Design an enzyme around this catalytic site. Structure first.
Site, PDB file in Angstrom:
ATOM      1  N   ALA A 188       1.629  -3.249   2.837  1.00 38.35           N
ATOM      2  CA  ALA A 188       1.881  -4.669   2.926  1.00 38.35           C
ATOM      3  C   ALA A 188       1.338  -5.436   1.743  1.00 38.35           C
ATOM      4  O   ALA A 188       0.424  -4.973   1.029  1.00 38.35           O
ATOM      5  CB  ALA A 188       1.238  -5.235   4.214  1.00 38.35           C
TER       6      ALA A 188
ATOM      7  N   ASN B  55       5.675  -9.498   6.081  1.00 44.02           N
ATOM      8  CA  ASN B  55       4.653  -8.541   6.506  1.00 44.02           C
ATOM      9  C   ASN B  55       4.579  -8.635   8.030  1.00 44.02           C
ATOM     10  O   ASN B  55       3.837  -9.477   8.572  1.00 44.02           O
ATOM     11  CB  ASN B  55       3.310  -8.937   5.872  1.00 44.02           C
ATOM     12  CG  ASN B  55       2.138  -8.085   6.350  1.00 44.02           C
ATOM     13  OD1 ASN B  55       2.301  -7.015   6.931  1.00 44.02           O
ATOM     14  ND2 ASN B  55       0.933  -8.558   6.057  1.00 44.02           N
TER      15      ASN B  55
ATOM     16  N   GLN C  54     -11.059  -4.893   0.109  1.00 43.07           N
ATOM     17  CA  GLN C  54     -10.640  -5.728  -1.007  1.00 43.07           C
ATOM     18  C   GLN C  54     -11.629  -5.852  -2.132  1.00 43.07           C
ATOM     19  O   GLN C  54     -12.830  -5.951  -1.893  1.00 43.07           O
ATOM     20  CB  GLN C  54     -10.336  -7.167  -0.480  1.00 43.07           C
ATOM     21  CG  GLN C  54      -9.221  -7.226   0.570  1.00 43.07           C
ATOM     22  CD  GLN C  54      -9.603  -7.998   1.827  1.00 43.07           C
ATOM     23  OE1 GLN C  54     -10.740  -7.926   2.286  1.00 43.07           O
ATOM     24  NE2 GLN C  54      -8.650  -8.722   2.393  1.00 43.07           N
TER      25      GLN C  54
ATOM     26  N   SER D  90       0.769  -1.231   0.000  1.00 44.35           N
ATOM     27  CA  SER D  90       0.000   0.000   0.000  1.00 44.35           C
ATOM     28  C   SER D  90       0.812   1.300   0.000  1.00 44.35           C
ATOM     29  O   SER D  90       0.242   2.377  -0.129  1.00 44.35           O
ATOM     30  CB  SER D  90      -0.986  -0.024   1.150  1.00 44.35           C
ATOM     31  OG  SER D  90      -1.929  -1.073   0.951  1.00 44.35           O
TER      32      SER D  90
ATOM     33  N   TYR E 246     -10.522   2.630   5.424  1.00 40.58           N
ATOM     34  CA  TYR E 246      -9.386   2.399   4.522  1.00 40.58           C
ATOM     35  C   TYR E 246      -9.727   1.298   3.516  1.00 40.58           C
ATOM     36  O   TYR E 246     -10.206   0.226   3.900  1.00 40.58           O
ATOM     37  CB  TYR E 246      -8.175   2.018   5.350  1.00 40.58           C
ATOM     38  CG  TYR E 246      -6.944   1.766   4.536  1.00 40.58           C
ATOM     39  CD1 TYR E 246      -6.493   0.464   4.340  1.00 40.58           C
ATOM     40  CD2 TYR E 246      -6.199   2.824   4.005  1.00 40.58           C
ATOM     41  CE1 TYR E 246      -5.323   0.210   3.647  1.00 40.58           C
ATOM     42  CE2 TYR E 246      -5.007   2.577   3.284  1.00 40.58           C
ATOM     43  CZ  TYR E 246      -4.590   1.278   3.128  1.00 40.58           C
ATOM     44  OH  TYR E 246      -3.399   0.985   2.512  1.00 40.58           O
TER      45      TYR E 246
END
EC number: 3.5.2.6
Length: 353
Positions: free
Chosen positions: A310, A335, A117, A61, A147
């Protein structure tokens, strides 16, 4: 390198790597405008390839900062306006829930609950339209921040439509090339594969999978040198010669919304400096009401400006303080928890403050 930088970086990153079991890591500290590089470990464990200053890491990101700046550049060019309805650039999006949803809302995750997503099932251009047409907002536009890759991802795709260029061509020609980020890629070319680190998840070597709006939300790969150059460009946008790019960078750091102590820019997120670590991914979904900053505050020099990123096998972090001409980039091929990233970055920049 000056011993102070050497020491705070090593004393901070070594314990980090040990505690989080990071296989490989690159760090760049930008101090008084000059970059200093550090690397540890492995880019590819099985082939014993070390991390070098030329190793490509998946930014995840952190790619959103490139999208936000490309969008800002398009605003500067007069191609789009953040106040424009999403439908101005996608008239096929006729479902009524879209009335009132502007490009600003998409860019800042305030459209009303677009999901994090894009579903795996969404692949074609027709699949994507169907997805957005069918989406039902939980909230009115401009009331809460959630987000989402699907929000700023769409912003990126729409923002380049007037240009006539593909998102990748626009990013290469308008951002990467002008800033000399010559080893920054949306798609890693075959010639560069020798430098592409493997990400590690549950001990398995992995690379990010193709997905709708991946380029726009989390698909950029870059080296620690190019990322240091990106931080320098964002620390001092007035040194950039391309007029609309200089302006776009400035727009991406403007403060559009406030939630708690944080201000949302285009890609970048900001807090007033000084800040301590507690105020600055363990939560899968965090809905927060936002307060509009009417009109947006131009980029504040005394800010902690940052973005975490990530992918399944990579963990990235970038933070800089314009007023101090200070910045840091931490790229890793695991991550690992975001708080550990922020705590290390703060420990390093505060010491050099």
């Amino acid at each position: 390198a000056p011993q102070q930088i050497n020491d705070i970086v090593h004393r901070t990153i070594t314990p980090l790597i040990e505690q989080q079991k990071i296989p490989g890591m690159a760090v760049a500290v930008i101090y008084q405008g000059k970059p200093y590089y550090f690397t540890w470990g492995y880019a590819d464990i099985a082939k014993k390839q070390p991390v070098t200053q030329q190793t490509l890491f998946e930014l995840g990101s952190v790619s959103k900062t490139f999208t936000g700046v490309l969008g800002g550049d398009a605003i500067a060019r007069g191609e789009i306006k953040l106040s424009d309805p999403t439908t101005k650039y996608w008239p096929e999006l006729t479902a009524k829930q879209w009335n009132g949803i502007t490009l600003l809302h998409l860019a800042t995750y305030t459209a009303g609950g677009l999901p994090l997503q894009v579903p795996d099932e969404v692949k074609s251009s027709s699949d994507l339209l169907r997805f957005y047409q069918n989406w039902q907002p939980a909230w009115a536009p401009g009331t809460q921040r959630l987000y989402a890759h699907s929000s700023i991802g769409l912003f990126g795709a729409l923002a380049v439509k007037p240009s006539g260029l593909s998102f990748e061509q626009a990013m290469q020609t308008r951002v990467f090339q002008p800033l000399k980020l010559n080893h920054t890629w949306i798609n890693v070319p075959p010639a560069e594969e020798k430098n592409y680190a493997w990400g590690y998840r549950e001990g398995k070597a992995v690379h990010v999978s193709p997905g709708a709006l991946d380029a726009e939300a989390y698909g950029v790969k870059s080296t620690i040198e190019d990322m240091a150059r990106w931080v320098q460009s964002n620390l001092k946008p007035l040194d950039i010669n391309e007029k609309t790019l200089q302006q776009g960078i400035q727009l991406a750091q403007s403060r559009y919304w406030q939630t708690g102590d944080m201000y949302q820019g285009l890609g970048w997120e900001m807090l007033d400096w000084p800040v301590n670590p507690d105020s600055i991914n363990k939560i899968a979904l965090a809905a927060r009401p936002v307060k509009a900053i009417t009109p947006p505050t131009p980029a504040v020099r005394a800010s902690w400006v940052h973005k975490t990123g990530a992918t399944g096998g990579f963990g990235s972090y970038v933070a800089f303080i314009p007023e101090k001409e200070l910045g840091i980039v931490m790229l890793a091929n695991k991550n690992y928890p975001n708080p550990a990233r922020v705590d290390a970055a703060w420990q390093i920049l505060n010491a050099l403050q």
